[PDB]
Amino acid sequence: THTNTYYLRTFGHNTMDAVPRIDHYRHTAAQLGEKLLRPSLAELHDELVVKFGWINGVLVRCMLNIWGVMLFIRLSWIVGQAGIGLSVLVIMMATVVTTITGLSTSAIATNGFVRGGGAYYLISRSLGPEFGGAIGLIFAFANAVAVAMYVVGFAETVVELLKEHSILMIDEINDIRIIGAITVVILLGISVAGMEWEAKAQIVLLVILLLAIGDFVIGTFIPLESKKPKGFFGYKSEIFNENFGPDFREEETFFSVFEIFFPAATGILAGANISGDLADPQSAIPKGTLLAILITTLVYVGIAVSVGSCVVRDATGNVNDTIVTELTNCTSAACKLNFDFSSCESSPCSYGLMNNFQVMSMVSGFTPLISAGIFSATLSSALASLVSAPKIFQALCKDNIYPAFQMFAKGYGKNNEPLRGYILTFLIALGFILIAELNVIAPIISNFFLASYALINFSVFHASLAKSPGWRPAFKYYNMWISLLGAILCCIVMFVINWWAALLTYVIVLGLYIYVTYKKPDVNWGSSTQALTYLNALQHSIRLSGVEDHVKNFRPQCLVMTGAPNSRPALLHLVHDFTKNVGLMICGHVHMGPRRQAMKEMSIDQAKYQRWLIKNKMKAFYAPVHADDLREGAQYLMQAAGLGRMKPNTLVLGFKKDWLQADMRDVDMYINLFHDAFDIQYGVVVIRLKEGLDISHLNVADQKLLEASTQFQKKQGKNTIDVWWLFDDGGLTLLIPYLLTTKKKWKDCKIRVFIGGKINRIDHDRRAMATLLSKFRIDFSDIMVLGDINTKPKKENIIAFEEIIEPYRLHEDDKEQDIADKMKEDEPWRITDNELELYKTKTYRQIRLNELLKEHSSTANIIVMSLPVARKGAVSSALYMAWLEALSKDLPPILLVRGNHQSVLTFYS
Amino acid sequence: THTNTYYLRTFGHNTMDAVPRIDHYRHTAAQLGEKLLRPSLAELHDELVVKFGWINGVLVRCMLNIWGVMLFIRLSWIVGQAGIGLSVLVIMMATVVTTITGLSTSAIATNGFVRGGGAYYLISRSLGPEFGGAIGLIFAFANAVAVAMYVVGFAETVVELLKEHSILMIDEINDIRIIGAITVVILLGISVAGMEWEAKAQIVLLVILLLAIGDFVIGTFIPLESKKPKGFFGYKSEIFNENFGPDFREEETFFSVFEIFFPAATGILAGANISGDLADPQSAIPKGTLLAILITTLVYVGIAVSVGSCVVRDATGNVNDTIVTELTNCTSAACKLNFDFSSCESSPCSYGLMNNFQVMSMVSGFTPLISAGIFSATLSSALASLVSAPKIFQALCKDNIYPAFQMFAKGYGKNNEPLRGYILTFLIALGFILIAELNVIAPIISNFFLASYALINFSVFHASLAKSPGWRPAFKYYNMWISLLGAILCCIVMFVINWWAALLTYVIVLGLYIYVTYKKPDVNWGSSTQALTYLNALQHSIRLSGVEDHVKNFRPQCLVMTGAPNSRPALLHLVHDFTKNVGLMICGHVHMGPRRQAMKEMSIDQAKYQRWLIKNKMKAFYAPVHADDLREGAQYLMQAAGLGRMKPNTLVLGFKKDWLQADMRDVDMYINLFHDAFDIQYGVVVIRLKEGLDISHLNVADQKLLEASTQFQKKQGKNTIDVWWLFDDGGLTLLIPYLLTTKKKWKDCKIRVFIGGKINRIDHDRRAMATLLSKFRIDFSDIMVLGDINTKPKKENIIAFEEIIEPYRLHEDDKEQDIADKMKEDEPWRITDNELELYKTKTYRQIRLNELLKEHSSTANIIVMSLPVARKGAVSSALYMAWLEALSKDLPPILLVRGNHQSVLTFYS
Numbered sequence A, B: 001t002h003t004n005t006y007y008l009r010t011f012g013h014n015t016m017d018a019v020p021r022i023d024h025y026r027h028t029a030a031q032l033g034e035k036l037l038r039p040s041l042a043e044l045h046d047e048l049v050v051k052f053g054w055i056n057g058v059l060v061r062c063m064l065n066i067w068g069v070m071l072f073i074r075l076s077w078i079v080g081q082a083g084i085g086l087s088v089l090v091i092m093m094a095t096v097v098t099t100i101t102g103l104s105t106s107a108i109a110t111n112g113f114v115r116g117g118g119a120y121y122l123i124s125r126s127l128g129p130e131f132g133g134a135i136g137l138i139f140a141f142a143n144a145v146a147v148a149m150y151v152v153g154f155a156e157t158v159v160e161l162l163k164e165h166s167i168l169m170i171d172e173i174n175d176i177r178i179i180g181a182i183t184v185v186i187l188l189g190i191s192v193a194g195m196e197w198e199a200k201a202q203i204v205l206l207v208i209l210l211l212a213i214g215d216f217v218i219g220t221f222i223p224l225e226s227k228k229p230k231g232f233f234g235y236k237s238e239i240f241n242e243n244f245g246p247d248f249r250e251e252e253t254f255f256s257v258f259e260i261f262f263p264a265a266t267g268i269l270a271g272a273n274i275s276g277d278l279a280d281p282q283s284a285i286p287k288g289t290l291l292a293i294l295i296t297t298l299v300y301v302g303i304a305v306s307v308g309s310c311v312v313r314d315a316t317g318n319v320n321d322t323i324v325t326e327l328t329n330c331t332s333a334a335c336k337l338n339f340d341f342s343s344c345e346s347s348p349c350s351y352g353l354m355n356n357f358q359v360m361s362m363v364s365g366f367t368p369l370i371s372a373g374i375f376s377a378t379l380s381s382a383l384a385s386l387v388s389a390p391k392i393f394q395a396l397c398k399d400n401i402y403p404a405f406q407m408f409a410k411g412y413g414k415n416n417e418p419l420r421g422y423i424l425t426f427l428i429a430l431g432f433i434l435i436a437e438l439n440v441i442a443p444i445i446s447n448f449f450l451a452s453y454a455l456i457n458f459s460v461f462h463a464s465l466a467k468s469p470g471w472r473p474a475f476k477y478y479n480m481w482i483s484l485l486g487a488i489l490c491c492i493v494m495f496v497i498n499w500w501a502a503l504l505t506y507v508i509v510l511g512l513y514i515y516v517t518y519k520k521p522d523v524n525w526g527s528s529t530q531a532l533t534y535l536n537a538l539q540h541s542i543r544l545s546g547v548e549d550h551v552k553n554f555r556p557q558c559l560v561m562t563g564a565p566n567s568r569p570a571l572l573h574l575v576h577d578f579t580k581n582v583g584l585m586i587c588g589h590v591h592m593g594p595r596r597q598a599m600k601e602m603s604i605d606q607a608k609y610q611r612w613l614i615k616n617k618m619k620a621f622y623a624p625v626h627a628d629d630l631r632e633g634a635q636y637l638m639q640a641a642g643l644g645r646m647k648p649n650t651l652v653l654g655f656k657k658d659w660l661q662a663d664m665r666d667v668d669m670y671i672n673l674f675h676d677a678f679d680i681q682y683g684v685v686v687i688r689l690k691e692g693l694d695i696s697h698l699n700v701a702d703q704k705l706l707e708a709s710t711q712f713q714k715k716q717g718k719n720t721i722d723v724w725w726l727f728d729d730g731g732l733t734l735l736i737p738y739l740l741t742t743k744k745k746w747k748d749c750k751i752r753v754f755i756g757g758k759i760n761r762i763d764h765d766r767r768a769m770a771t772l773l774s775k776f777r778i779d780f781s782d783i784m785v786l787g788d789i790n791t792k793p794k795k796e797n798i799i800a801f802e803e804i805i806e807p808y809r810l811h812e813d814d815k816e817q818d819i820a821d822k823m824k825e826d827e828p829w830r831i832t833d834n835e836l837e838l839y840k841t842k843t844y845r846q847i848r849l850n851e852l853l854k855e856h857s858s859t860a861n862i863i864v865m866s867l868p869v870a871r872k873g874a875v876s877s878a879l880y881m882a883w884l885e886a887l888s889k890d891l892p893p894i895l896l897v898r899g900n901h902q903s904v905l906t907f908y909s
């Protein structure tokens, strides 16, 4: 029926359904998605500029940042004060911390597409805005200060080089400050020039540093007799054996050495912070960072061991001190080789592995080459930090976490460059350089770095804890327990060095976290915090599902038929008063009208009203439902609403005030709602107000209605709480008012109970009731026993009730049997004469109860009375409505309660 | 119509409804007559021996138990080693701990009738069986050991009194052993004699103790020169000032003094342990315990101050006197009055406050009275402990918490008295007396008492934390924070003295708690633990209700329509595999039949199936519903099931295997269930098995069906998962198999992806799909692109489909245009020729897809394929069912998935 070419066309061209394509999931505004538009379910169902590679962008950056001052200056001192083994152990511990941090970072960076800000973006998108902003501020400031520290190191090295000659301008501190200012200006200029220039400069510095390392390694293998007077002796096993072990020749300990060394391993995130300029993160960051860490650790360990195997701790440089005669009785490591480096214990000798900070330069075949290597290392580290800080700050400011800093987010040029961030970082670094004494500052910045690492590790662990299906990290060489251990180790290490610095950093982090949480920025990124919230709720619900029910653990789980949650405020607040912190509260709303529009109406209403309830401080659940009429929607809610053991057991309704001026079908639906509630074993609570409950539409009447709506919101003075417990429903009638009095807004109100008694047994019945409610431990102010019930109500009230009921009567007696049956068939709510004759006693009881309530409980703050139960099929809906209206007419706020008839009170324990 | 009578009769005689009466809430066997019967809601709605008072039962017992050895023996030593102020401080600290414990006990004992036992009953009924059993065992053993210690103290005092004369039988330790054995036998006899006899003995002992205290107080006010050589001097401000302030003569310390004194504060629970024999608790325990504590503390403090204000720390027995008309050169308090009790700073003088342990006897005006008082105090404390232990043990054994001890709950006599418990306590006490050296044992028992007190305080705090409406304590003189502070103080105090004893007691408590929780005795007391479980679930749900939705936080919340949870095991386990630990799972069951019987059936099913699910380790929720047909119940569940944000979003049901051999109305209801799910914005998952899903009714066919049911309960093995993602439904089709692979039972299985492409573009489409799913980070083992779709399926398959569809065609073309319309109206599921002509392409697509699946995925462990969506009103129900049947048949387990069409996957972070 068609050509063979047609049968081989593109799959999906003959159907509205779309094949899965990348454009369906991309949100980027690329050509507005001309063809990347997957059809919605309704449509198918409804009736008819510069990017860097991983090598240059991550590996080189991380290596340059990690290698700093200690590479050529303080490594020898560390290997001296602590033996080869102890120094290697310190290096390995720092490397372990950094490696755990790198694994966590690689895991976090392989989940989605990272945009900008290495540590900040990852931490924020994986944990939440609070932690994200706190760590962003901390890390940015730490990098800004590290820029100054590196510049100061370079300046001090150059000043020492000048002091090696006659060149000098001012005192040492002032010369250091001048050199630091000049160097920081040069670095700022280079950084502002552009990112490609920075990359080229970094490559040059890296090659210079590698040349310096190679020069040192070559020099250590070419001993010269001239260096023999100094500590250098070549590779001798005697020196290696002697240099082992912790000869702490000063007021310093192992922990102090570790603290001194640690800043040497705090450049691992240089590549990550360039995520905004990486060609392809999720493939460059992990491998580059891990390789850089491995290379730097290997170089550190090798250099430490080599320096410790070819230099003596103490060596008194003196040409006329070698030879050591011919035969010696000296057991010293130097003595075994030559007399050089002898008699140093008493007289403090010039240098050696313990007192000289230029041993690496001396060992190297070429000294100026090592000097250039030191310069390049320090400058490279400073440049990396100075580039990293503005990127993190701009990423943090783009999110508007701190509105005051929104200025430092604008970009310049083809590639968005935070020039303002660069200027701010330059200012901070220049200030800290002008201080020129960063010895005290260093522990604080080290602790800042450790806090950032620990929060990265904790973010990985937290994400692995909340088993969100979106976690799905691409990197598969991590572990939740390893990451948790890494976070704990980071905290412990930060506390080990400068405990008070650790306390200060923790205080700062906590303060920033609290500020951000209070601010609550308007943004959600799908952090693991929300996933953990859902998982915790689910686990707690599952746990509660296995708990057996007990009478003393009973709580009122009320399904309030409120319509729009804001439509009826009085009912909502009243139900909230005895439900908050005790029992569940579901606000049920039934939507009518066309299903097509009702679906969108309910979809909007869900979010709108849940947000309204949350913002209004009411701990309720919105439960929208779409149904033809109110009765069937209530049926839906009473059958399915809730989850597990947290389902409703009480139905709360507002009184149908306008039942007289309304279609009898609506009244029938109301009474049938009552009947269904009773049928499914539900407690029923009806709240009646003189003015009504609905204020959505909203003269004198409107003002009174609004006042009634707002009445149950302030402190309820102390007037009374009248409970007319006439029938034993199981105790709910008494449990409601007690829970009311248990709240602050109702504490001043006293509960006085009304019961029906015998005329000649008033005292006995009163005592029995008092004892019964004392066993229940329900405080009461007074007990009134009424013997006037069952009396005939006044003639006027009966006449009024009859006049009210006349319109809805059937008058079967005065009509033909067939006509009466036909009338009752299509109007089932009609009141039959037989039922009126049968229940004249109940009608008189309702009227007399209204009389008694008016006479006695006419000044109560709120009234709780037993709700009459009409046998289904025996009493008409109109008769039930008339009973309810007569019972509670012309009264202050009243509640009609009819419990499950299962006991909800107990005097046993 | 009625006389004056019948108008003033008892309220409630003319109605089935009952007035509230205590008989309605009493559950005791007696008083269950017709009068004390509350009518059920259905019945109203359906269509037509010795008891002690608080004084002698609690106050006297508590006072006698609290007062023990230290009252007349070591109080002087305590006031000596420490100062008056420090001794008062230790007394006040112990009293504070005991007073907080007493407040907590009175709070816990005023929350209903306490049946029997002592602290065990209160702790169990307020906290749970685990804590109850642990504390019961600990407390009973502690009381038995305390009996042993009191007997040992009495024996030691009597042995010392004998040594004061020329009376002795064997070595001191052996004589102590004989005296202790005799005393314990006498105490056991007295206790077994009854309880009234014990009360009379206790009253006699209390009178003797009061006489002894009065004798001491009288003696301290009548100084005699004979006792002047001893430390006694009468009241003198010089001695008071001298004795004020610590003087730790020996290797003692404040903490050691506190540890020595603390056992003096125990015994506050003697009255509460006789709760089963009190006239009424909730009125005797609180007041009696508090008054006893107050009186004992006042007496302790007064005696301490009096002894420290009228006796010198060091004194000499040399009657020769001192300061015989000499000059006053010494500032010692003794010199102020006379030289007596001086000059023993180097040599150890005879006795005094520091050295003598009978100063109270000497100070008193009649030593034999003080000796009798010591005897009475020790004997009364021992008797109280020996009575308390068996009561607690019997209460613990009556609950069957430890089945091995069920034999000790038996009672004897008119009043249930545990004789076996008495014998066991006597045996334990006799053994510990035979040890005769309880110095090392005292700290352990002290820590046991402290643990009991701390857990009482923690029970009060926990009850106040779980805001159960049944808490309602009658004693309104406590505080949750005060009780928590008391528990913490008890723990800290127990750890302060004998830290290793505290660790041992904590280990024992933890072990007993773990054993009880593992055993999980079948008991339900309505503890604070269950209330806290409910409250925690509610709070977590409320918190989750305020969390905004995100694509990466999406979870599959599946409303699996399974009927009876055990009826279809394969479907339940399959849904559990990709829902456990990730997303919600509600098992929906629809009940049909008469409403009256259906309600009871659903009520039974709720408990039965929730228990079955919990016992079978399935984290699902049972959701019963009563409706006329399956569609109505599914509508109920899809509209109302769930709570807050934890509500279903995916519909899972089994394939209607027997649709061909079934009424077309049922098939129409099935297809309309599909349509309703799509309309309500639900994802739909259909699971089809060759043999079916139902195994409730269950030859070869039955065996195969059972094997299919059990197939998915084991480890899958090195099979493959075939995903035919043909249409972009949002990613659910791919999300489900990934979640399957996330679990251990599906680790081996690898995901194979099938997509539709164009011939001559296979490589490009395969690369694009691989890239797209690599950005999603879902691992795959291979990607197959099929270009042979849209081709005409074999003639035989089309003929078979036509033959299958024949009995449901409308055949409108060969009709009169009126009979056809009538048939369509009567049976809307009829397949019209117009729709068949329109969707021949879709039919051929289904047939060819089945061909491709059989040819390619015939060996997959499980198949996931996109579920075709039929436009509502355009495709008949019969045609939709035929499409589904043709698409899947003669295939391994297959899942048809049609997501919400909202994206559930993302490559952004």
Ligand SMILES: Nc1ncnc2c1ncn2[C@@H]1O[C@H](COP(=O)(O)OP(=O)(O)OP(=O)(O)O)[C@@H](O)[C@H]1O
Pocket (backbone or CB within 6 Å): A560, A561, A562, A563, A564, A568, A588, A589, A590, A591, A630, A652, A653, A654, A655, A656, A657, A658, A659, A666, A691, A692, A693, A694
């Ligand atoms: N969607 C709904 N529409 C109307 N009433 C609802 C709805 N959902 C629950 N209800 C409950 O059913 C009752 C019906 O009252 P109705 O509006 O028929 O009489 P009314 O005198 O207008 O009441 P109100 O003063 O509350 O408007 C309300 O009090 C309300 O609590």
Ligand SMILES: Nc1ncnc2c1ncn2[C@@H]1O[C@H](COP(=O)(O)OP(=O)(O)OP(=O)(O)O)[C@@H](O)[C@H]1O
Pocket (backbone or CB within 6 Å): B561, B562, B563, B564, B568, B571, B588, B589, B590, B591, B630, B652, B653, B654, B655, B656, B657, B658, B659, B691, B692, B693, B694
């Ligand atoms: N109360 C229920 N009664 C019947 N089916 C239900 C019910 N609740 C949910 N369902 C789902 O609807 C499907 C209807 O199956 P049906 O009663 O037609 O028997 P079937 O086609 O032989 O399949 P099965 O082997 O599951 O019985 C079931 O697979 C089941 O998953």
Ligand SMILES: NS(=O)(=O)c1cc(C(=O)O)c(NCc2ccco2)cc1Cl
Pocket (backbone or CB within 6 Å): A066, A067, A068, A069, A070, A071, A074, A146, A149, A150, A260, A261, A263, A264, A265, A266, A381, A442, A443, A445, A446, A449
């Ligand atoms: N102690 S040091 O001179 O060898 C040293 C060495 C280095 C270094 O990077 O090797 C270093 N980096 C900057 C830094 C400080 C805190 C965190 O990072 C700082 C210092 Cl003080």
Ligand SMILES: NS(=O)(=O)c1cc(C(=O)O)c(NCc2ccco2)cc1Cl
Pocket (backbone or CB within 6 Å): B066, B067, B068, B069, B070, B071, B074, B146, B149, B150, B260, B261, B263, B264, B265, B266, B381, B442, B443, B445, B446, B449
């Ligand atoms: N230290 S004491 O001799 O004055 C003493 C005194 C008492 C006493 O009850 O006064 C006491 N009661 C029994 C007990 C031990 C642990 C807990 O309770 C035990 C002792 Cl050892």
Ligand SMILES: [Cl-]
Pocket (backbone or CB within 6 Å): A266, A267, A268, A269, A270, A449
């Ligand atoms: Cl870093």
Ligand SMILES: [Cl-]
Pocket (backbone or CB within 6 Å): B266, B267, B268, B269, B270, B449
């Ligand atoms: Cl006690």
Ligand SMILES: [K+]
Pocket (backbone or CB within 6 Å): A065, A066, A067, A068, A263, A264, A265, A266, A267, A381
């Ligand atoms: K570094």
Ligand SMILES: [K+]
Pocket (backbone or CB within 6 Å): B065, B066, B067, B068, B263, B264, B265, B266, B267, B381
């Ligand atoms: K005691």
Ligand SMILES: [Mg+2]
Pocket (backbone or CB within 6 Å): A694
């Ligand atoms: Mg209205």
Ligand SMILES: [Mg+2]
Pocket (backbone or CB within 6 Å): B694
């Ligand atoms: Mg079936």
Ligand code: NA
Pocket (backbone or CB within 6 Å): A063, A064, A065, A066, A067, A068, A376, A377, A378, A379, A380, A381, A382
């Ligand atoms: Na560097």
Ligand code: NA
Pocket (backbone or CB within 6 Å): B063, B064, B065, B066, B067, B068, B376, B377, B378, B379, B380, B381, B382
């Ligand atoms: Na005693």
